[PDB]
Design a protein around this ligand. Sequence first.
Ligand SMILES: *[C@@H]1O[C@H](CO)[C@@H](O)[C@H](O)[C@H]1NC(C)=O
Lengths: 22, 50, 49
Amino acid sequence: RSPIEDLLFNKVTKGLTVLPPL
Amino acid sequence: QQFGRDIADTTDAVRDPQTLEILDITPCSFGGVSVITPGTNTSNQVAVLY
Amino acid sequence: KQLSSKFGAISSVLNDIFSRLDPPEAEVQIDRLITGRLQSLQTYVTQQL
Ligand SMILES: *[C@@H]1O[C@H](CO)[C@@H](O)[C@H](O)[C@H]1NC(C)=O
């Protein structure tokens, strides 16, 4: 990933299921 | 503290007599199933998804 | 919060109602609590759509 992309990724942080993205 | 509590206000712990064990309530749950098939004009083979 | 709410019923768990209350009016309480859970979840899915 790009250093800007890495910085953006670092900045962004029971009967239920979460569909993984395609 | 005989029993614990989670966010969803469900039972997740119990104090069993004579053993004083943890014995967490309902760790195991269900599982999902999905079917992948092509059109009926081609074939009828299927696949199982989790 | 909605699934933890009593929704005007006696208990939020169906097991206690089934093991304590008589079969009369137990289905009434169960229906009331589940339809409260319904109306909560259709409202919820409307905000998410
Ligand atoms: C249950 O009884 C045992 C002895 O028979 C005792 O050691 C234990 O503390 C009791 N459990 C309680 C009081 O929760």
